[PDB]
């Protein structure tokens, strides 16, 4: 039914699950805006091939050529799966608005579910190839923000009663580096083109005169070409037509309002902002040193992971209010820092 | 069936569902009176677009153009699914209504789907975008109360046998920042905006003739435009029109029903009252200072969700019990919390 | 199938789960009487729903016209779902009954499933409001009970080899507060004013002459209201009318007997008997004061609640065991207390 | 499929599932002869619902009036519904029999699920008031034997290196007290009562002429009471009628093959006999005192309990397989209890 439909495809976690292995424990390893807009640009046209043959919507068949009343059901059936399997023999069926509508017509469910997969792929290539790589990379960082913290919290614990930056040499060299933003950015604009390629093609379809679903059908290929009982040819006409309009036009609406938010991802550079690790510079065990902006490195893309998945962080949680804190000044960051004990 | 529906959609926890990670355990991230009013506005009509097309309700097919005794059962039914896909074709009917309410009355379900997608959209934003934050915030003050307690009643002890205000400095920071609130408000509004156009939407159709179903249509176009045989136009019912009347009415009182409490919701600092943190302020090392009231920030957005998800801490209940015997005064507020004995 | 539904309704645990939450870990929540009252007022309803179109007890289709012989099946079909359609236009059809006993036939199922919701809003309101504090508030009691009387044996086995009635002021205090115990009637009054009025209906409904569905329809508007070839009139009958009115009557005789015990609810001080907190007046270190009878305040419904769930509290089972060999009076309170041995 | 309903009602744990939940691990709660007396009760006559409509033994639809050739299908078939709607309207129909017959041909179904719902209640009612109380009673005296078990052997093994009988105290007062037994004696004569009622039904409805399924059934009341071309009546055979009486006089000779088993049942304190307690005579720290025996009082239904559920307990077990050994004689009861080492 259409609200089953729509409890799988919107109000459940479709494609929102979680890796599920031990591997990645809490780690989204996808961006909320990247995920969103996967998750709309597959999800929406399944939802829409749904919708278009839900039992209340649909008539019936697809297709009824209006046989001659001495026609039999089975002749009418015939005639009807006839022109249904003849829509792509052009010599058949004589239809002003030509053949293409017609293969359009009768093939757009697996239209859509093309643009759905191949919109699909780039998400599944990501989390196939360069996802486990920044899985561990960012495991390793959280731990040493986690370690290093500690020691911090330890030394002014014994002041009140190695040290290399590990972790800031790690990012530096990660500046360097560009295979995981260029692997991103290739996956994104793959994800435009096909959503251009789809709005395209969708537009195309809406833009048809609807009356292209009504096409001349001729069974008089055989020994039925010289039979005389049966007319020279049928008016068949493609029932759902005008939905699947409906719903390409909806689905163009989605994807021209989705293609600026691909836009705006693409330019990574732009959205890391708001250090994460400003925060960790009051750590006298941490280097007073952020170094990560205004690069097209993985840097800027490893910020943004950060800054996406770093709320799971007791130390970064830690830290982050201590900042807040520090905004009226009454206090001092030390002073606090002792007083939260929050080691773990 | 239509108990199943039930059962389904009001009887279960339809949308209730508590997110399923462990990064939120037993946290709401969502008020009761928000929760109630999404799940309303997205469940109902789900429900109304299953219970419109259950198969008891439902004669049978949605359309029915009485074709004549000499048309076969195939042209009939050609008949029926042409007009039924000519709906948008205004050419080929003719109705006193227009064609307008023949759209609607096609596409009742998908613009019932659309209501419900557009208000599940404002929650999901709110979940996905401004309750990590909120989640974090919320568990560190929950522990730091946790904590301040542990340590109060320790010294407790001691006597019987740092001391910072980060929490209270926290929130005072968190009266500034509006962030939060703001995209509260936002949300709120924006399911306001979409209840108060389902409504207008629903009146409108509720508002039909109830003779707007049926419309004459005009299978006489291509090779049959001159043909004789066939009648110049068809009677064509749509059924369920009624029942699509009854449930856009029930809809309607729904939605006119709930628009109030969402008017309520938006004015969140009349909300804010029943000073959660008042209890709080018998504690030796707890400041007596509350600072939470009269203000469009996110401070009393973080007050609602306290005095919310407040319950689960034994901390809270030991001193909200203090504070309810304390309306005698028998007794004294260190004594009675040096009996609790309720550290942990 | 019958049998299903009957599983599914009666001998499954169809709204008998208990809350799936750590937070109410083994309590109700919800007293048996209004256990039972809710799920038979919700689950029959549904139970009846669901069997009048069952496989078996359905015969077909819900209305047949009885079109003339010359018309062919679909013309039939259309009579048959116009009429369907225009039970609700007045016009259409003529009726010795009148049109709302043929809109009651239409819509049965959509009133049996208003009653069933509109009986499980009360409940529901209870368990999302007046739950969790009910809760919080048993659990700290019983959590206090047992603390106590591990003090208390503790006390004895001390003798043997703060002292402050926390509890006991909670109650007292409790006493004051009526929020809780006014909810608890509003709801129940609502469910008895939903009971009533459904019994009003089904009554009605009964009432009929069973000839009512049985109307004359007639498909003459528009090209077809001055059109030769059809009988001015048609012959319907909504079939399962009969089901209808059986299942109706038998609704409303589960309905008036349930009633009494709505209105025995009702009266919370009556039902609050039996004191619980008799029976750990014997503790010394439990002071000797019951103060819990005689008003319409929330410590008669928490009386009920802890009589109704304190049996999982092996201190209260152990001083209720006492209590009973104290019916004999061969042995001593305070020997038979040290020799149980119950600490935990 | 026939299969299937077997594996679900005779093959699974259908109402043979235990309590789901923690406060009863390990206990029945229920007899074993009282549980098989409402399994049988209960998923006889829905089996036989089922089998009645299953796919294979179904011809088809349960009426059909036989009208003739001139009339259309949808005229048959709305003579057909018409009818079956139409057993209860007296004035339309003319049976031999009379029209109760066809009340209980048609309605068959929803009486054996009447009735299984009537025989499924009692012990519904036992589960929900007195199953509870029992189960924290029972579990006191396990947890009791068994502490005492330790105790007394702990004692021999010291030899060989309070003393209150609280437990015999407890069940002296249950001697006293009736609750329980009484609501268990009304519970199985309401069974009792319902399979006798069963039972008469079944036979009424098995002794009829096997013709009064055979029904004459007359379209001729409204526009078409004056109508020539319809017959003045028609011949309509109730379907399954035939599968329906065979099935009921299995239900009968199953209940009267049962009530014996139930009126069994009812002398609880005949029942109650080979004395669990008597093994426990032998402990040094047990008193020699069974006093359990010719009662019409709880204490018997609980004597039964034990012997129903005392298997699962350890010590029980131990001093069962002493008293075993006892009958030859040729070692000492003290002196196998020591070297058994038993205690868990
Ligand atoms: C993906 C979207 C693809 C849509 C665009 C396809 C490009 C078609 C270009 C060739 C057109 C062509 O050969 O001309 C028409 C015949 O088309 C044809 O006979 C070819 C039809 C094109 C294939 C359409 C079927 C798509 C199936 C997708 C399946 C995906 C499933 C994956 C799981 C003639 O007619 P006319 O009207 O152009 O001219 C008639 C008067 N000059
Ligand atoms: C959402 C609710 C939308 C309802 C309001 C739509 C505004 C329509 C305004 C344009 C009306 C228009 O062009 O005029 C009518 C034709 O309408 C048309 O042909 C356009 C019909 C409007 C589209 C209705 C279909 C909604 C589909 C929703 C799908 C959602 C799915 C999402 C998963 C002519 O007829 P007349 O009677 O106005 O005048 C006839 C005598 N002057
Ligand atoms: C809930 C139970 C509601 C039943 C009582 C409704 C009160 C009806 C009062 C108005 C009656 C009225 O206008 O008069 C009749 C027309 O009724 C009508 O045309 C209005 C019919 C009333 C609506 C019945 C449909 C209930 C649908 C429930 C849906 C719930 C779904 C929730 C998920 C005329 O005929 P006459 O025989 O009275 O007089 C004919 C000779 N004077
Ligand atoms: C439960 C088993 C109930 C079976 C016994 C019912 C007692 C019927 C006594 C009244 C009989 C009566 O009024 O007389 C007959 C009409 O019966 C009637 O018109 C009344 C028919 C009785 C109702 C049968 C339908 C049972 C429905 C059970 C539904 C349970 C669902 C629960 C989920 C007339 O005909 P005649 O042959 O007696 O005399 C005809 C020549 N003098
Ligand atoms: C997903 C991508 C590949 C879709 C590409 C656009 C598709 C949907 C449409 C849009 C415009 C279309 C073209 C419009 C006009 C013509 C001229 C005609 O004589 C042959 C077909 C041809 C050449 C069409 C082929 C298909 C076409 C290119
Ligand atoms: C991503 C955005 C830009 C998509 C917007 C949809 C655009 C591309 C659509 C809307 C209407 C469409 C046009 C509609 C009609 C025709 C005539 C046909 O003979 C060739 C294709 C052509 C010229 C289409 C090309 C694509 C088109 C311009
Ligand atoms: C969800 C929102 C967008 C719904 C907006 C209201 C819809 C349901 C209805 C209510 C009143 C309607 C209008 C009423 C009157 C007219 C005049 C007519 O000559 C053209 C259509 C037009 C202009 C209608 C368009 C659709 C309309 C605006
Ligand atoms: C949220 C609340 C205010 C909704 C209440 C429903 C209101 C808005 C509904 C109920 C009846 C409706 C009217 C019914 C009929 C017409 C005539 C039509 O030619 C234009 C629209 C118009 C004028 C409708 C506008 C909207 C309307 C006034
Ligand atoms: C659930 C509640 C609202 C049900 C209320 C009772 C319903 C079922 C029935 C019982 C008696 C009925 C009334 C009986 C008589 C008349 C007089 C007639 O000229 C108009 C309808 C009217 C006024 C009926 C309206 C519906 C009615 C009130
Ligand atoms: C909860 C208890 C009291 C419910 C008992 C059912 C009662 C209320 C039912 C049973 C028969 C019913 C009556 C049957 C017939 C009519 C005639 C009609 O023109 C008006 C309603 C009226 C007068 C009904 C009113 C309600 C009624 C009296
Ligand atoms: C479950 C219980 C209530 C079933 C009771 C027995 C039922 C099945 C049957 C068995 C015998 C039957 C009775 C036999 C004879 C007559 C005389 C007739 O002129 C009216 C019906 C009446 C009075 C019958 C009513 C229904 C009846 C009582
Ligand atoms: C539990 C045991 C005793 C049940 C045995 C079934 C008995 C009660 C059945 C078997 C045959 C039945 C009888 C069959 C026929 C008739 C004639 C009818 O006009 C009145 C009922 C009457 C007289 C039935 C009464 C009940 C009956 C005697
Ligand atoms: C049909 O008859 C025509 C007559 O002109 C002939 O040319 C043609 O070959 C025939 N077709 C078949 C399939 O026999
Ligand atoms: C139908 O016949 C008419 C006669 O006036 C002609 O104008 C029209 O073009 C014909 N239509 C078709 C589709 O051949
Ligand atoms: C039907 O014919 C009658 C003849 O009196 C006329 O009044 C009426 O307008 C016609 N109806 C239609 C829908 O053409
Ligand atoms: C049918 O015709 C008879 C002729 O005697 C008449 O008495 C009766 O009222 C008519 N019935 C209807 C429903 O018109």
Known sequence: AIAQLATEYVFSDFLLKEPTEPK???????????????????????????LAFAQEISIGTQ????????????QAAFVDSYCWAAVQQKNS??????????????????????????????????????????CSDLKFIMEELDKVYNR?????????????????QYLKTKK???????????????????????????????????????????????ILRNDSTVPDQFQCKLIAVGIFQLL?????????????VVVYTLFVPFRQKTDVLKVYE????????????????????????????????????????????KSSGQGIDPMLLLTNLGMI
């Open 24 to 50: 990645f424990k809490g780690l989204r390893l996808e961006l909320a805006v990247d995920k969103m807009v996967t998750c709309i640009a597959v999800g929406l046209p399944l939802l829409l091939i749904s």
């Open 176 to 222: 360097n580096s560009n295979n995981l933003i260029i692997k991103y950015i290739s996956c994104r604009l793959l994800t435009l083109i096909i959503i251009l390629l789809a709005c395209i093609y969708l537009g195309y379809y809406f833009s048809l005169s609807s009356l292209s679903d009504e096409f001349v059908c001729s069974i008089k290929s055989g």
């Open 93 to 134: 069926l004589q239809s002003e608005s030509g053949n293409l509508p017609l293969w359009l017509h009768k093939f757009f469910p697996y239209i859509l579910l093309l643009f759905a997969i191949l919109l699909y792929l780039p998400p599944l290539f990501w989390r196939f190839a360069a996802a486990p790589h920044i």
């Open 282 to 325: 009051i750590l006298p065990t941490f280097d007073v040193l952020h170094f990560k902006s205004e690069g097209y490195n993985d840097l800027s893309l490893y910020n943004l992971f950060l800054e996406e998945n770093i709320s799971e962080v007791k130390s970064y949680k830690c830290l982050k209010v201590l900042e807040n804190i």
């Open 63 to 74: 297709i009824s050529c209006f046989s001659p009343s001495s026609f039999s059901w089975r």
């Open 248 to 260: 390409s036009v909806i689905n163009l609406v989605v994807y021209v309002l989705l293609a600026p």
């Open 152 to 168: 911090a919290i330890k030394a002014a614990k014994s002041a009140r009663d190695f040290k290399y930056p590990i972790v800031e």
